[PDB]
């Protein structure tokens, strides 16, 4: 049980291929499908400590109610791990086979999806092979941890140029900020005396970096408009044993103390009850079901050799936004029906179980027509149809079962 399930692959021919089956298997499973989702992503350069940090996100996700979740100092780091099989820089994006169910403060039993997004952001594998995944995971995440080395550099901000172009359009269309949280995680920070480790120091740091000369890095002037939350955490260097090694055999004892001290505040600061942010688009809390719709949409857009036109992107999330309002209606109805005549439920009367259908179907039609939909009036007629012929095919399956 549990492990990385490479979902979105980027093959040698600029082709983004999405393995739907594995994806449905995880997100569609009957335990989670209906719970609202928190989609946490860590993006950024390969070989910068991502896997490492993620294995520690797991140590916490599992052993969440126990102070010593960091593990046994005099034993070798031994959790599930994300670095399981990396024979190469397979530059796509994997997610954690197991979802996690947790209770936020106010009560909602929400679900938590972790996604490691590999890329390079370096050589020629960038044009359509880096800000492509990064683009991807951002769109669908609710929390993006942008894992950087030593400093937020001009070239790091450059990769956001895309998101601010798209976000500006989504904002015009929707009147809401496009994205949720963006967390700048700076690793091996080594000017404690200039800005303290952790979030407070990070906040002052990130304020200085983002102010305002410089080229077309007026990503500066628009980021903020795009995310409801940008924030920053300054992590220490892990000591030389960790940094000097391909695979890190040693024990927790061998990691630097001031790194452990801050990692211990870092992980709960990101995950954990109050910190979690439910995925939200055009005002609509996405669910685990709903979120498969977005994956599906954002993946037939990143096909070809050209990153998409911000205009096509917007249209991708409109299709998804629409396909999701449909998916809930074909479930609001479905659940209400399973009450009037499901399981060992009684009754009958065709002439009667018809009006309770036209009833609930009309109720469910409003539910849809009302959901703030994006795309526009005509664009979503296509989906009003899709809806009705699914509630109707669901009806049939109830007439059949009703007969007794
Ligand atoms: N300097 C430094 N090295 C790290 C840190 N975390 C992990 N490493 C090491 O640097 C390499 C990065 O490995 P990994 O976590 O797989 O990075 P990823 O492939 O980008 O996810 C590993 O050999 C680690 O032992 C860090 O915070 N700072
Ligand atoms: Mg990795």
Burial of 225-240, coded b for 16+ CB within 10 Å and e otherwise, reads ebbeebebbbbbebee
| 186, 148 contact by CB (below 8 A) | yes
Phi then psi for residue 179, to 5 deg, are -115, 175
Beta bridge partners of 109: 103
**Residues with Cβ within 8 Å of residue 318, at least 6 apart in sequence:** 374, 375, 379
- 42 and 9 share a domain? yes
| 166, 310 contact by CB (below 8 A) | yes
Q: Of 281, 307, 333, which closes a domain? A: 307
Instruction: Round to whole Å and give the CA distance between 86 and 329.
Output: 41
Beta bridge partners of 38: 112
Is the CB–ligand 1 distance for residue 262 below 6 Å?
A: no
Instruction: Round to whole Å and give the CA distance between 78 and 62.
Output: 13
- 357 and 288 share a domain? no
Instruction: Round to whole Å and give the CA distance between 340 and 81.
Output: 47
Nearest to 64 by CA among 253, 258, 276: 276
| 287, 27 contact by CB (below 8 A) | no
- 186 and 312 share a domain? no
How many C-beta atoms surround the C-beta of residue 4 within 10 A? Answer: 21
Look at the block and give the residue holding tokens 């029906």. Answer: 337
Tokens coding 127: 């044009």
Task: Among the bound ligands, name the one nearest to the CA of residue 233.
Answer: 1
* Residue 324: CATH number of its domain: 1.20.58.420
Confirm whether residue 125 is marked as ligand binding: no
Q: Among 77, 146, 243, 246, which is best to mutate for testing ligand 1, by the most ligand atoms less than 8 A from CB?
A: 243
Structural domain count, the chain: 2
Look at the block and give the residue holding tokens 């800000």. Answer: 131
- 289 and 318 share a domain? no
By CB neighbour count within 10 A (0-12 exposed, 13-18 middle, 19+ buried), where does 270 fall? buried
Cα of 188 vs centre of ligand 1, distance in Å, is 10
- 398 and 278 share a domain? no
Q: Are strands 8-11 and 37-43 parallel, antiparallel or unpaired?
A: unpaired
How far is C-alpha 84 from the geometric centre of its chain's CA atoms? Answer: 22
| 293, 301 contact by CB (below 8 A) | no
Look at the block and give the residue holding tokens 């949409």. Answer: 297
| 177, 171 contact by CB (below 8 A) | yes
Tokens coding 6: 């490479």
- 126 and 53 share a domain? yes
Instruction: Round to whole Å and give the CA distance between 237 and 214.
Output: 29
Q: What is the 3-state secondary structure (H, E, C) of the chain?
A: CCCECCCEEEECCCEEEECHHHHHHHHCCCCCCCCEEEEEEEECCCCCCHHHHHHHHHHHHHCCCCCCCCCCCCCECCCCCCCCCCCCCCCCEEEECCCEEEECCCCCEEEEEEEECCCCCCCCCCCCCCCCHHHHHHHHCCEEEEEEECCCCHHHHHCCHHHHHHHHHHHHHHCCCCEEEEEEEEECCCCCCCCCCEHHHHHHHHHHHHCCCCCCCHHHHCCCCCEEEEEEEECCCCCHHHHCCCCCCCEHHHCCHHHHHHHHHHHHHHCCHHHCCCCEECCEECEHHHHHHHHHHHHCCCCCCCCCCHHHHHHHHHHHHHHHHHHHHHHHHHHHHHHHCCCCCCCCCHHHHHHHHHHHHHHHHHHHHHCCCCCCCCCCHHHHHHHHHHHHHHHHHHHHHHCC
* Residue 143: CATH number of its domain: 3.40.50.300
- 337 and 393 share a domain? yes
Instruction: Round to whole Å and give the CA distance between 117 and 136.
Output: 9
Nearest to 203 by CA among 139, 143, 269, 159: 269
Query: Which atom belonging to ligand 1 lies closest to the Cα atom of 243?
Result: 3
Q: Of 282, 307, 332, which closes a domain? A: 307
Tokens coding 325: 């309002």
The experimental method is: X-ray
Cα of 245 vs centre of ligand 1, distance in Å, is 8
Instruction: Round to whole Å and give the CA distance between 170 and 148.
Output: 27
Confirm whether residue 63 is marked as ligand binding: no
| 51, 147 contact by CB (below 8 A) | no
| 44, 160 contact by CB (below 8 A) | no
**Residues with Cβ within 8 Å of residue 234, at least 6 apart in sequence:** 186, 189, 195, 196, 197, 198, 201, 202, 205
Resolution of the entry in angstroms = 2.8
Query: Which atom belonging to ligand 1 lies closest to the Cα atom of 83?
Result: 16
| 113, 141 contact by CB (below 8 A) | no
Tokens coding 50: 């991502």
- Domain around 194: 1-307
- 256 and 383 share a domain? no
- 119 and 26 share a domain? yes
**Residues with Cβ within 8 Å of residue 196, at least 6 apart in sequence:** 234
- 111 and 228 share a domain? yes
What's the CA angle centered on 235, arms 233 and 239, to 5 degrees?
Answer: 175
Is the CB–ligand 1 distance for residue 244 below 6 Å?
A: no
- 224 and 348 share a domain? no
- 78 and 99 share a domain? yes
| 128, 305 contact by CB (below 8 A) | yes
Breaks (C-N over 2.5 A) in the chain follow: 212
Q: Of 269, 287, 307, which closes a domain? A: 307
Instruction: Round to whole Å and give the CA distance between 25 and 97.
Output: 9
> From atom 19 of ligand 1, which residue's Cα is the shortest distance away?
47
| 241, 225 contact by CB (below 8 A) | no
Instruction: Round to whole Å and give the CA distance between 144 and 349.
Output: 53
């Amino acid at each position: 049980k549990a492990g990385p399930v490479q979902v979105l692959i980027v093959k040698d021919d600029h082709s983004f291929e999405l393995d739907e089956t594995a994806l449905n298997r995880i997100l569609l499973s009957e335990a989670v499908r209906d719970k609202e989702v928190v989609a946490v992503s860590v993006a950024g350069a390969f070989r910068k400590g991502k896997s490492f940090l993620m294995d520690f996100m797991l140590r916490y996700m599992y052993n969440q109610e126990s102070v010593d979740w960091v593990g046994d100092y005099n034993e070798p780091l031994t959790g599930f791990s994300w670095r399981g099989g990396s024979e190469r820089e397979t530059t796509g994006i994997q997610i954690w086979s197991e979802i996690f169910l947790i209770n936020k403060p106010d009560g909602k039993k929400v679900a938590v999806l972790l996604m490691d997004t590999q890329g390079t952001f370096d050589s020629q594998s960038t044009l359509r092979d880096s800000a492509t995944v990064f683009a991807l995971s951002t769109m669908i995440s609710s929390i993006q941890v942008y894992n950087l080395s030593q400093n937020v550099q001009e070239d790091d901000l450059q990769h956001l140029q895309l998101f601010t172009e798209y976000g500006r359009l989504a904002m015009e269309e929707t009147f809401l900020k496009p994205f949720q949280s963006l967390i700048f995680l700076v690793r091996d920070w080594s000017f404690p005396y200039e800005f303290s480790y952790g979030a407070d120091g990070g906040a002052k740091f990130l304020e200085k970096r983002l102010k305002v000369h410089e080229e077309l890095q007026n990503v500066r002037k628009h980021i903020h408009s795009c995310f409801t939350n940008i924030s920053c955490f300054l992590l220490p260097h892990p000591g030389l044993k960790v940094a000097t090694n391909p695979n890190f055999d040693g024990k927790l004892k061998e990691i630097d103390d001031e790194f452990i001290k801050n990692l211990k505040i870092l992980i709960p600061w990101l995950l954990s009850p109050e910190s979690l942010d439910i995925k939200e688009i055009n005002g609509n809390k996405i669910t685990c079901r709903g979120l498969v719709e977005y994956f599906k949409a954002y993946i037939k857009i990143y096909q070809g050799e050209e990153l998409p036109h911000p205009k096509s992107m917007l249209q991708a999330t409109a299709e998804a936004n629409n396909l999701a309002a449909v998916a809930t209606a074909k479930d609001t109805y479905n659940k209400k029906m399973e009450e009037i005549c499901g399981g060992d439920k009684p009754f009958l009367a065709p002439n009667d179980l018809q009006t309770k259908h036209l009833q609930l179907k009309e109720e469910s039609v409003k539910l849809f027509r009302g959901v703030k939909k994006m795309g526009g009036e005509e664009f979503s007629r296509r989906y009003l149809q899709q809806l009705e012929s699914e509630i109707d095919e669901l009806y049939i399956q109830y007439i059949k079962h009703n007969d007794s």
